[PDB]
DNA sequence: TGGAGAATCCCGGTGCCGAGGCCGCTCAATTGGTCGTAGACAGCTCTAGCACCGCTTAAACGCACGTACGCGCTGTCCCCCGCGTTTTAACCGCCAAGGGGATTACTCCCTAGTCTCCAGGCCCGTGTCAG
DNA sequence: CTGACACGGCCTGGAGACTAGGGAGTAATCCCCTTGGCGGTTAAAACGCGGGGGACAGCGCGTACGTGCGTTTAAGCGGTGCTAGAGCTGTCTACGACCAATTGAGCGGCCTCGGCACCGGGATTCTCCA
C-alpha cells in the first residue's frame, strides 16, 4: 500500500527525530484484524554516548544494547518494576535513541480498557509508557522485529509545541536540564508539564 | 480526692479472714500490688492487641495476658475465676 | 508422631564448643547434663510463651514473631528477625 | 426505670468492675474496651488479693497477731513460690528478710 | 601439651559467628518440647533459628559467668556448682 | 496549594518525621501528639543510628571488608561502654562474641 | 510492610560512603530503630500520665531521652533534637 | 564528705541481715562505693522526674518511678 | 570473766537483724548523703521525708541482697569471711558496672 | 557431762493512738437509646511446611594413655571478733519563717478533624562487583 | 566464580489549608510541709587490746579430662510431592462509643475503744569452761 513509512523516513539525527515524531499516527496491527489509530503527544531523545542519562553512557557496549550498527530505526524494548517495558527507536549514529512516552487513541477504547488489567478516567487512560506498551501487547520477543516490514505496526501521516527539560533523571551531570522534550500546548492529557517553560 | 483499692481489699480480707484486720502500711502495700498487677495485665493485653491488629481489649486478651504473666497454678486458678465471672456476667 | 528424648541431640562436642566460645579452658564431666537441664528450662519458658502467643492469634504455625515477642517478654531482645 | 444493680454485684465480685473499666479506658491501652474485660480483670485482681491476704492472715495467726503488718505480707509472698516468682523484683517496705542462715556458718 | 589446643579452640570459636549446635537435633528438641503445650503444631524455619540464636547466646553468657565463678575459687575447671551459683545470682 | 516541602527536610533530618508522627498517633501513647515530638524523636533515632553505623564502619574497615555484617555491629555496640549499657539485654543474631581469655 | 531501610542507607552514605550493608545487618538496624522508638515513646507516655497531661510534646521526649540514654549519648541526643526542633520551627 | 556517715557498724548490721558471719576490713569502702553508685543512679532519675514537672522538691512518687524504671519496684509509698 | 567464742555473737546478731523489720542505717547521715548526691545534679533542691524514707528502704534492700549474693560467693570459695572480690564477682554476674 | 553467767520468753498491768465504724454528700457509675464500624464468618489462592530417598563426608563416638590439676592435710601468722571505756553526734521536741505545692479562673494558641492533591517509597527480574 | 545487592510504574499516605474547641500556660492566693537552729538526754559509734581462728601458701597424690586415632553414623544438601493453612477479601451484624438523666456508693471528716508496744519479775534454755 501507500500509507506506510519505510526505513528511509527515519534517516535523520536525534533532534529531527524529536521534531518529526510528533502528531503522527501509530497503528498497532493486532492479529484480530483491527486498528488502534493512536496519536503520540510527547517524545524523549537521548543523544548517544555523550549523554549521561542514556543507556550507552561512557562507551557502554552491553549485548542487549546492540541494535544500532546495522540499520537506523530499530525497534527496542527493555525491562523496567520487573514486568514493565518501554518503547525505543534507534536514531542515526551509535547510541542515539528516541523513547516513546504517551499517546491518545480514537477508537477501540474497550480493548485497552480491559486488556491493561492484570479509576478509569480519560486523562489517566493512556498516561504512562509501560501500561500503554502493555496495551499494544509488545513483549520482549519483539526486540528483533524491524520497524517497517511484514504486517506489523508502522507509521501513518497525520492531518503550539513547547520544549521542556529533563525530569526524573536526577540532579547531577550537565545533560539533565537541556530543553528538548516536545509537548503540544493546550492539551490537558499531558502527564508531565512545565509551568515555567510555557512562557519561554 | 484520691481513689484507692482500700474498701475492696478490706472486703476480701473480711471474707477470707473474718477476725483479722489490716494496718495502714499493709493497705498501702496491697493497693500498690493491685495497681502493679493491673498495669502489668493491661500492658500485656494492649501489646497482644497491637500485635494481632485488634483495636479492642476483650476477655480473651486479658485471659492470655494472665496466662503469660502469672506462674502456672496462679494462672490456672485466675483464668478459671475470670471465666466464671464473665459467664455469670453474661447469663445475668 | 511421638518424639522421644531428643535432649541427647545436644551432644558433648556442642557443649564444649559453646564453653570454648565462652572462654572455658577445662570442663567437668558433669557439666553436660546440667547444660541439658538449663537448655531444657530456657526452651520450655520461651516455647511456652511463643505457643501462647500463637494460640491467641488462632494459628497452628509458630512464627518468628512469637519467639521474638516471647524473648522480649523474658528480658532478652533478639534483633535480626523482624522485631 | 429499673433498679440499679452494680456490674460487680451481677458477676459476684467485690472488686469494682466499672472502676476497672474507667481505668482501662483512660489508661491508653486500646481505643475500645470490651464488656467482659473489666469483669475478667476484676476477678483476677480479686483472686490475687485473696491469695496474698489468706497467706498473710495465716502468718499473722502464726505470730499471735490480729492485724496484718508489712512483715506478714513479706513472709506470705516470699514463702509461696508462685507469689515470690511473680513479685521477685518487688521490694516490700518494712518487710525484712526471711530467717535463712547457711549450714556452713552454724557451729558443730 | 594439654591446654594449647583448648586455647586455640577458644581463639577460633570467638572469631567465628557460626552456629555451634547442629540444626536438626535442636529442631527435634524444640518440637519435642512444644508437644507438651499444644498438639500438632507447625513451626517456621525462622522460629527455630531464632530459638537457636537465643539458646546459643544464653549458654555462652552462662558459661562466661560460670568461668568467672570457677576462677573465683582458684581453679580452671568449671563444675556444676559454678553453674548453680551463677544461675542463682542471675536470679534464675 | 503552595510548594509541598517535606517536613523531614524542614528539620534537616533524614528519618521519616511524618511516619514517626503517625506511629506515635496510632501507637496509643497519648491522646494528642505535639508538633515537635516527631521531629525530636526522628533526630534522636537518626543520631543513634549514625553512631552505631560510625563504629560499625570502623569495625568493617579494621577487618579489611567493605560491607557491614552483624559481627561488625556486635563489635561496634560492645566495644563502646554507652551502647553496651543501652543494649545490655539485647542479643544480635549472627553477632558472635568478643575475644577475651 | 514498612521499614527504615532507605533511611539507614541515607545515613550510612552520609557517614561512610565507601561501605555497603547486608540484608541481615539492615534487619538488625530496623529492629534497633523500632526498639529505641518504642522505649522513648513508652517513657513519654508514662511521663504524660504521671503529670496528668494528654500531650506528648518535645519536653516529654527530651526527658525520656535523658532518662533512657546514658550520659554522653544523652547529651548529644538532646543537642541534636534541640537543633532539629529549632530549625523546624525557625522556618 | 558525708559517705563516712554510713558507718562501719551500719554496714556490719546490713551484712548481718544478709547472713554474713565474718567481714573483712576492706568491705566497708567497697560497700560505700556501691551504695554511692546506686544512690547516684536512682537520684539522677528522681531529679529528672522532678525537673520535668517543674518542681523544687523530690517526692516519694518520683523515687518510686525512678526505682520502677530500674526494675526495683518499691511497694508501700503510694501507687 | 565470761567471754563468748567468735561466732556466737555474730549468729545472735544474724537472728536479731533477720527477725526485725527496722531500718539499720541512721536516718540523718543518709539524709546528708542524699543531699550531697542531689546537689551534684540540681542545686537548691528540697526533699519530702517520704522520699528519703523510700530511698533508705530501697538502698537497704539492695545492700541486703548484695550481701546475700556476696555470702554465697564467699561460701563457694571455701570461706566464711567475705572480701571485696566477692562483691565484685556478685556485681559482675548480676550485670552491674 | 555439771555450774554459772548470760540471753530469751511468758505472763500481768498500762496507756496510747491508730484502726474501724457512722454520716453527709458529691461525683462517678448505671440505664436507656442510637449509630457507626470493628470484627466474626465464609471462601479462595497460593506460600510454604512436612514427609520421604539417597550420597558424600564431616562430625560424633568409643577407647587408650598420660599428665595437669583438683583436693586433702598441715603450719603459720595476720586479722578480725568481742568487750570495756571515752568521745561524739543522732534524735526528740518546739518555734518559726519562709518557700512552695496545690487549687482556681481565664484566655489563648495549638492540635485534632477533614478535603483535596500529589510526590516519596514500595514492588521487582538482570548489571555488575567482593569476597 | 557467583550470588547478594544496587540502579533502574503507581498509589496511598503525607502535606497544605481551614475550622474550632479544649488543654495547657499564667497570675494570684492559701496553708501544709520543709528547713534550720537550740536544748539535752543518751543511745550509739570510735578506739584500744588480747587472743583464737581462719585465710593462705606449700606439698603430695590419685584420678579424670585433654588429645589423638580409628570406626560409625546421621547431619546436610539436593530433589520431589502433597496439602494444611496463612493471608487476603467481601459482607453484614451486633457490640461498644457516646450522650443525657438518675442515683447511690465511696470518700472526707470525726468519734471512739481495743490491739499492741513497753516495763518488769521469774521461769527456761544457751553457751563456755572445767
Numbering used by the authors:
A (entry chain K): 82 to 199, 208 to 248, 255 to 295
B (entry chain H): 30 to 121
C (entry chain F): 20 to 102
D (entry chain G): 11 to 118
E (entry chain E): 42 to 133
F (entry chain C): 11 to 111
G (entry chain D): 31 to 121
H (entry chain B): 24 to 102
Study text:
The engagement of a DNA glycosylase with a damaged DNA base marks the initiation of base excision repair. The apo nucleosome structures show that the presence of a DI alone perturbs nucleosomal DNA globally, leading to a general weakening of the interface between DNA and the histone core and greater flexibility for the exit/entry of the nucleosomal DNA. Mechanistically, local distortion augmentation, translation/rotational register shift and partial opening of the nucleosome are employed by AAG to cope with substrate sites in fully exposed, occluded and completely buried positions, respectively.
In the AAG–NCP–50AP complex, a DI was introduced into the position of –50 at SHL-5, which could be regarded as a roughly equivalent position of –30 in terms of solution accessibility. Subsequently, the structures of apo NCP–50I and AAG–NCP–50AP complexes were solved at resolutions of 2.9 Å and 3.0 Å, respectively. Despite the overall high resolution of the AAG–NCP–50AP structure, the portion of AAG becomes highly fragmented in the sharpened map, indicating a conformational wobbling of AAG on the nucleosome. Nevertheless, the nucleosomal DNA including the AP site and the inserted residue Tyr162 are well resolved, enabling the modeling of the DNA and the assignment of its post-catalytic state. The overall position of AAG was determined by rigid-body fitting. In the AAG–NCP–50AP structure, the engagement of AAG is similar to that in the AAG–NCP–30AP in general, although AAG in AAG–NCP–50AP is angled at ~60° against the plane parallel to the nucleosome disc. Further DNA distortion was also observed upon AAG engagement, and displayed a predominantly local effect: the maximal distortion was observed at –50 with an RMSD of 3.0 Å, and the average displacements for the damaged and undamaged strands at –55 to –45 of SHL-5 (–50 ± 5 positions) were 5.6 Å and 1.4 Å, respectively. Globally, the buried surface area between the DNA and the histone core decreases from 7134 Å2 to 6248 Å2 in the presence of DI at –50, and further decreases to 5977 Å2 after engaging with AAG. The degree of local DNA distortion in the AAG–NCP–50AP is less than that in the AAG–NCP–30AP, but the overall similarity suggests a general mechanism of the engagement of AAG with DNA base damage in solvent-facing positions, which leverages on the global structural perturbation of the nucleosome by DI nucleotide. Since the –50 position is closer to one end of the DNA than the –30 position, the large local DNA distortion around the damage site could have been relaxed by propagating to the end.
